[model samples]
Structures are given as structure tokens and as C-alpha cells.
Target chain A: GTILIDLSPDDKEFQSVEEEMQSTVREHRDGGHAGGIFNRYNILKIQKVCNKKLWERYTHRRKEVSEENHNHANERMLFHGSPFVNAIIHKGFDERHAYIGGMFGAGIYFAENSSKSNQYVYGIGGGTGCPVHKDRSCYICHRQLLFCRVTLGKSFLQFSAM
Target chain B: MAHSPPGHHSVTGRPSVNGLALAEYVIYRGEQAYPEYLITYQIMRPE
Candidate 1:
């Protein structure tokens, strides 16, 4: 009933990021370390649409990343996946689609690189499944938005929709 | 913490769901239902 548009998952920025990350693990994940850098700024800057609380969650995450060592670099990124879900990359699952597909979120950051560079926010990890119907007005914590029912292979967050 | 986060479910032990919690805050199938929660996807006011 609705259409979905996805940004370039392989956009140039992400591509360059991949090149910069020498490690196969870091390159394969972290959207090439985009979130490692993008996650540092307030959510307000990520895009104008985010609210205060979501920003809080972002910043709080920053603090968590700033404090780490060699053993914890893996924690720098979080990826969401499901055995039952497919990796379609539809941008965001509309309220109607979430039920059929599972969602996932990827969080990434950099700390204690072998090069001895300063630690920084690398990238974000996201996507997950939540059931929802578009026909009614519903309530969720923090703000008013539509929900996506994800089963597997989805983005952590959905873009704004009409 | 006797029950740290008060159990959200009712005695029926089922997910108590409704549309009133949605953006429209209006219910489906009945006249009395109203939305309690309003969830949106993402709000991107582009420049």
C-alpha cells in the first residue's frame, strides 16, 4: 500500500569509510566507521528531525564509548540481525511491513586503534522489529511516530514518513 | 526493589494493546477508543 525509498547504503561516504578502516572486521562492519565519527555529534546534527531524548541516548552512548581499552573495541559497534529476517535494506519498515520482516540496528565507534589515534565515535548500529498498524493514532514513549514490524534484515531506525 | 519496573501486563498475562496509543489516538472497531500513545517513524525536516 505504501512505497519505500532507501538512501545509498553504499554511498560514497560509507565507501570511503570502509577504505579507511584497515581491519576486515571494522571495514566489514561500522558502515566503514561512519558512525564512529557521525555518532559524536548531537543527534540534532545527524538530521533535524530527532528529538531531545533521542539525542540524550546518543550522547549518553558517546560517553560510554569514550571510556574503553583494547579489549572493548568490539563493543564499539552493535549490529542487529535475525535468523528469520532477510537482509533487504528497505530503509525503514512501514507500520504494515514490520510484521513481516525483522529489523536490525548497527552501532559503531573507534577506540585505541593500532595506529594510536584518539578514540572517537565510529558509527551507529541499528534496525529491529516492532509491530504496528498505520490506520490508528498510537502512543509511544518520547514522541509520536509510526512503528515498523521487523523480522530480520532491517535498519535500526526508520526515516520519517507521511 | 519489590518489583523494579512494575509489570506492564495485566492479570490476563497478554499484551494489552490498543490504537489510542497511536498518533491519531483514535481506536478501531469501537466508538469509545482513543489513542494513548503516538509513535512516528523518524522526523526529518530537511533543509
Candidate 2:
């Protein structure tokens, strides 16, 4: 159908609903053993919830979040940062927009010197991020900078709403 | 965002912001909704 379907910039209720939806979706679709969790639609589900919950939590804490903290979180979500906050946001994320939150790229990398083997590998694994920046070439792979897929599904989401 | 003849927030009375579809889907499916759900996805890289 050619009908338009997306949340309105001015609608709070609509935003709230989707916000909640996104959270539960993230939790529901995440976890379990699989080749790649988000590779499946389940990731989309969990991500939605995670994003909303994180933002709302931050929003709620907005009173205590100090203008700088909120800006930092917002900035990371928008452009740069490891997205550690996005990773730890486990529950209570909004449920309305659970199915509409989006994703993006993030992370920093370091190469291992050949003279000495760097036996340690540290960093978070998800989308594009470097929770623990890597500083070695994996024995398994000769390359250093591990290229991870940022968010593959919907993001900067324009929710489909009524 | 087309409305299905809901007209004023008075006719549909659906309220605002529907929660996660999964939750609603599970609830709709009743207890049978548990266990597992399989789905597919598509992705792309930025230049």
C-alpha cells in the first residue's frame, strides 16, 4: 500500500508506545546461542527495547544526569562512543517503541606488533564497538582491526504508526 | 502514518503507543507463545 506509516515528531503517546515496544522487543529477541543473535530479527526486537529503555532511563535520570552526561549519552547514540550504556541497559526500557529503535556503527582498534605475540584479546562484542579496545593480531587471524557490523537493522527509525 | 478510519482519538479509542509487538503477540498466542521464535534479517555496510 502507498499509505504513509510512521510516528509523528509531535506525538508523545505514539512515541511512548513505540518506546516501550522497542525495549521488550530487545529483551525478547536477544540471548540464546546462535551464529549471531542480531543476525536474526530477534536482535532487532531486543535492540528496540534496549534503545528506548536506555534513553528513558537517561531521561528519567535527566534530573541527575547533569547536562554533560545527557549530552554524552545522546552524542554517543547519535554519532561517536563505545555504546557501553547501550550494552548494559537490560530491562525497563520503553515497550511501545520496542519494535522501532535503530542501530549504528562504533568502536576503536589497535594492531599487534609482529615481533612479540600479543596473547590477549579484550573488547565488547556487538554491532560496531570497542568496549575493550584490542591491541593484538589474533593467532587465528592475521589481521588486527576486527571489522564488526554496526547495527544492520532499522535505525534512526521512523516508526510505522497509526 | 495512515489511520484506519480511527478518526478523532474518540473513534478508535486505541490510546497511544502500542507496546512491543512480541509481548502482544505472545499474549495473543496465549501460553503457547513460549519456547522459541525463528526469524530472518537483511543488512548493509556504510561507505
Candidate 3:
């Protein structure tokens, strides 16, 4: 259902994504958090396949929403930080297991700034079947973040939790 | 909390808690988003 295609370090697309993460973290720093300074090593392009019907349904819904709101699908690339990156890649984004009592509400959360998203990434050191090394010798601990294309069609602004 | 407003598909929050510097978007349906990239990085510390 989902495949991860490794992007080479020299690839233009890889560089662009790397730059986005680096610049966002450098500028925002997640309110000056310590995790702001990090080195991105690898990037894998998520390829979701064999879901033609699902894709069609999503496109249809986007079109319908666009028509209703006159907002042209209102899509944006956003960041979603998580420790269970493998689960997300396999099962897609599910709001049921999302953290409760979020700033706005319990839904699949995303951030425009990668640093803000990075705050949620924690404890990916072991036992998650991550491709990265998971041993004591692995001095540079690794974390994962998802760069997603989110369709925020007809978005409602909320000042506080519902 | 589970769903957006009657006419909206997602929720955007820009609360002042801890001086949040960016807006957070929340979508109820999984179909509204697609994971395009998996970024792997390491937090650099003084060695």
C-alpha cells in the first residue's frame, strides 16, 4: 500500500525538502527549543499505491469542497511530527489515536513550521522497527517527521480548544 | 473536536499559548491529507 523510495542526497527534490526543514527550524526554533538544531540525513519519498479508488474519492471530495467554498482545493504542504512514522506510512493518518485536548481539538494535527511539528516527535530510540540504527553505539539519535499535502478546504479558524 | 464546522473541512488554530509562532491545521478525515515525504534526522548535540 505504501512504499518508501529513497531520495539521493544530491537530488534536487531532496535538497528542497531538506532546505524547507532546515530553514523552518532555524527561523522558528519551536519557541527556542533545544531540538531546533538537528542534521537531516535521509529522506524517503512516500509512494502510496494500489488505491485508485481511494484517490478518486479524495479527488472527488476535494472538487466538491472547492465548488462549495470557491477556495480551489486550498491545499498546502504541511509537517506532521510523530514517533510512529511506520504506522502512519502503513495505515495513513487516523485521528482516533491522536493526542487528546489539543490546542484546537483532537484531530490530525499539522504545522506550517517544521520546528513546531518537531515538538511532538519523541522516544523513537528503539522497538519501532525503524530503518535507522537502534543500538547504544548509535550516538546520533534519529527522529522522523512526515511532510504531507493537506487539503484544508473551507477552513474554520478557532482561537481555543472546542 | 472530532469534526470541523458545518461548512468547513478543517480547523486552523492560532492560539497565543506559549506564543505559538505558526498556525496548526487539523483535519478529521484521513482522505484530506497524504504523506508525501518521510524525513529522517538526528538532533545534534555538543559532543
Candidate 4:
């Protein structure tokens, strides 16, 4: 059976991201605290492609919304927020491979840090896991985007992705 | 609530999961999903 490119957990694009992150974490986890940033630019490249795939799944549910507002200019919002999903980078998971929990249904996806001995695993959730916490924490939320960030506490809101 | 708030653009519309909400919104455009959000690495320390 041929698996659709979209559902392929071993996707090259995502694997690149997973590996890049793992490498960064492994390099900085112990001493330097230095590595790749994997900020906004990287995620945007793949966001659209992933968004479309997500939108396709929900088109059936949103058909009524689109039809009712046919004249409205609102480009149906497909994916929303990407919440951080980090697992302590350990030695169990495969650094070169990504794991998608497809059995969980629509938005279930997961990937390990690209490092063989990852210090920590981190990435945002979207795709099936969209519309994350607007301001609070949610253990039940789906963090879909494969993204990363480091909060600097008080100075967190000061600087930006610029 | 102030009566005449001048150009008080709400910082962002998305959730602040990791305090990167503002940057996230700026990078990942609301409906457009900006390219900046795709920058996959930081050479400097995160502030």
C-alpha cells in the first residue's frame, strides 16, 4: 500500500527540522547553551504546506461556514496557534526518525529531537493540533507546529523574532 | 479601561504558550504564515 506523502511521518522536510532541533539541543544542553535558533523563518516555509493538509481534513465541517459567508473576505482560518511540546531529550527515541501518533486521529503527531542523546525535545503543535491556549496552559491542547523558542522570563516580551 | 487609547494594537491574538506569542504572531502571520517564522536557527542567545 502506498502511503500519501502528507501522512508520511518520515518526511524529509520535517525530518530536517527534527534533526536540526536535536542537534541544537544536544550541543547546548550541557555547557555552552548555544545552538541553532530555528525561529520564525524556518517554520513558515513548511507551515503553509502543512496548513493545507490540515484544512483539507476539516473542509467538510467548515463547508457550512464558508457557504454562509461566501461574500465575506475572511480567508477561512485553517491552523491557529502553535504551542510548545517539549519532552526531556533522552536516549530512547530515534534521532533520525519522527513518530506520528496517527491512530489518535486528526491532529495527532509527534517527533523526537534529532540528537542521538537529545538534551530536550521541543516543537510546536498544529496540523491536527491547532488553536492552542490563547493565554493559559493546557495539558489537553494539540501543539501541531514543529517549532522552537526559549522564554527569557521578564525580558521575554521585549525582543522578538525580528 | 481608558477612553482614548491611542493606536493600542493588541500585542497579539494567539495564545502565549512559551511567551513567544508576539514573536510567533509576528513571524507566523495570522492568515498569511510569514516566512520569518520559518527561520530555523539562532546564532545568538535568546533574550
Candidate 5:
């Protein structure tokens, strides 16, 4: 003796179709506490409706943002600054790019352009620069100016009168 | 500098007159879709 399930759209007494399928799959596979499941060929399902709703709520803000609003936010960032603005940006920063943003964002920075390492160093804001290279020791590191990685090649070559 | 693709604008820094101020602006258009970002820097100082 067996029963039948006549699925109806208006029937709101039961769980959703996705819930039903998830539960049925779990029960049919016998994957309880023990290692009693093989989901090698099993395809994971995502709730597209839920995802769409979340996207509309969150990611859609970009669609509504205006150039004036962005400029205002940028002004705020340059002046008082806010952590909330930074918080909204996800963890999407890579090494070199993040370095570029960080170095420039911190204010005045001497961009290091070399055949080997092209990057930026922490710079003193306002009117200040690394000491004019006369000594061999690096302004940043204890190593010799020529050996220090932080030393700007062009600056070093010029300082050395080469 | 490579040629800008269609619908893309590449701007080098503003030419510095004398030796007082400099400005550079670049756009990072990822995928030609949303999240088109702007990167800019300006330096001005007095002698």
C-alpha cells in the first residue's frame, strides 16, 4: 500500500519544494550522524529567489548612487573620514593593488619605479622627504643605500653622482 | 601607454607647470560592468 503526493501551488500547509527535495535527498541517502553519504555526483542547489532578493537589498545600492553622492563621500574620506565607508567594501584587495591604494591613500608617497620592484613606500606628509643620500646607510633600513630595497634606483644613482 | 579600448578612457596625469603641483587620475573598469572605480592623486606644495 502506497500514497501519492499531488503537488499544488496554492497548498501552503507544507514546506517549500526545495525544502522537500533537500529533506527527501538527505533521508533517502541515510546521511545522519555517521559517515553514510556519498554526494560525489550530487549538485548543490542555490535559492535564486532568495539570492535575488538579497542582491536587490544590498548590491543594488550602486545603481542608486549618484556622482554627487560619490564626490561627497570622497570628500568625507579625504577630510574627516568614516570607517563605515571602508566597511562596505568587501575583502577584494590584492597585494600590489592594495599596496598602491594604501601608499597613495596615506598621503604623499614617493613611487618606487625599478626594473625589479615597482612599488611605493610610506612617505612623510606635508613638507618632508627622505634625507638626501650622502651616507651609505638607508634612511628606511640599516642596510647600505645601494643594497636597501627601499632605495629609489634613480634617486640613488643621482645621489651617487652616477 | 596602450590604446584605450572602446568605451574606455585613459588619462595620464595633468601636466605639471613649473614644479609646484601634480595630479593623476585613472579609472579601473573591472569587466566593463558595475563597480567602475576611480583612482586619483594630487600633490601640491610650496617652495
Candidate 6:
């Protein structure tokens, strides 16, 4: 079960979040033109249904990691674009489904630049129906991206394959 | 690498190689990430 809370465009929180997303794209956009620009249509907060005990366990583990690493636990907001947006929103990030042969080895991949993440995004177009824009004609060209909070505790700078 | 070095939780890849134009961060644990916001958008082309 999942709950999608729509944020109104006029909402201050929405405006700030939108600006952050847009600026991230502008700052890290590739010099060569390929995907053009991203024009956001809507922003939604994903709240997955979880048991209280499960959520508590997750928070506890995150806190432990944070305390161990220090410096705000090295947490950062990153972009993750994928075709399985629905699955991710429901089940969260699972390394088991990650690509096995990534450049830095198999793990959950994220990007500081939205453009890099955009490379993996698949449009929900053609006959493939959209979950949110149901019965809308413009839904033919919808794509989704996730802005996630990632805990990068004591990160290792990987220059080459190990 | 499936696991980070002892005491390390994630890996950051160097940019401009391996088909990556920007820095890539990888974390081994699924619990280390929370998908907070979902953005729905469309790409605009120069006309």
C-alpha cells in the first residue's frame, strides 16, 4: 500500500522543492544537448504503508549508522531515475535488483546530477498507462524521478574497478 | 564491489569515465536510502 500526497504549486514547501530540483538539473546538465529540459508537472510525497515495528527498526538502524559515521551521518539528497518507480515507491531501494555489472560494482546507484539519473528514466508512454494521470491525453509522455535521502556514511572514493 | 571497506557505508565513483558524466554514489544497504519525493515531468524540446 502507498499514499501519494500531492503538493500544490502555490505551496511554499512545493516551491522550494521545485526550485531545488530545477537548479540541480541546471547546474549539472550536460553540455551536449540530448534530453532537452525537464518541465515538472507535479510533485508527490511517497508514503509507503509500513508496520510501526518495521518503521521503528528502520529508523533505529539509520540512527545507528548515523551516529557511527558522524558529520550528520554524511546524509545527502540524491536523484534516482528508474523504470521501476512504482516498485521503488512501494518496496524501497533493494540492491538485489540493481544492475550486476555497474562501473563501481553492483549496488544501488544514485547521482548528484539529475541529468545523469535522467539517462535511466523510461517514459510511461504509448499504450502503457500511467498510475497518476489516468484518463488524461497528455499522459502519453510522462516520466518519473525520485529524490531520495541517502546515508553515505564514511564514503570511499572509488577511482577504478577493484 | 558488493561490500564497502570496513567502516565505509558507500562508494562514490569518479566522474567523466565509465560512461558516467557525473559523480555516482552507490550504497550497499537498502535501508540506507529513503525515497522521499516523486517528481512527474515531461521533457521539452527546442522548437
| Candidate 1 Cα deviation (angstroms), residue A78 | 4.0
Model 6: CA > 4 A from native = A26-58, A123-140, A160-162, B16-22
User: In terms of TM-score, which candidate is strongest?
Assistant: 3
Overall local distance difference test of candidate 2: 0.21
Tens digits of lDDT, candidate 2, A69-131: 333222111111122222222321222211122211111211111110011112232332222
In model 5, the runs with Cα more than 4 Å from the true position are A1-119, A123-162, B1-6, B19-25, B29-47
- The TM-scores of all predictions, comma-separated, are 0.19, 0.18, 0.75, 0.23, 0.18, 0.74
lDDT of 1 at A91: 22
C-alpha positional error of residue A70 in candidate 6 after TM-score superposition, expressed in Å = 3.5
Arrange candidates, best DockQ first. Answer: 3, 6, 4, 1, 5, 2
- Error (Å) of candidate 1 at residue A102 is 19
Off by over 4 Å in 2: A1-47, A50-56, A67-162, B1-40, B43-47
lDDT of 5 by residue, B1-47 (tens): 12223332222233234232222222222111111111111111112
Model 1 ranges with Cα > 4 A deviation: A1-5, A14-52, A64-75, A83-162, B1-47
- Best-fitting candidate, scored by lDDT: 3
Ranking by lDDT: 3, 6, 4, 2, 5, 1
Candidate 4's C-alpha runs over 4 A off are A1-53, A76-162, B1-39
Question: What are the Cα lDDT values of the candidates?
Answer: 0.20, 0.21, 0.67, 0.25, 0.20, 0.65
RMSD of each: 20.4, 21.0, 4.9, 15.6, 25.4, 5.7
Greater-TM-score candidate between 1 and 3:
3
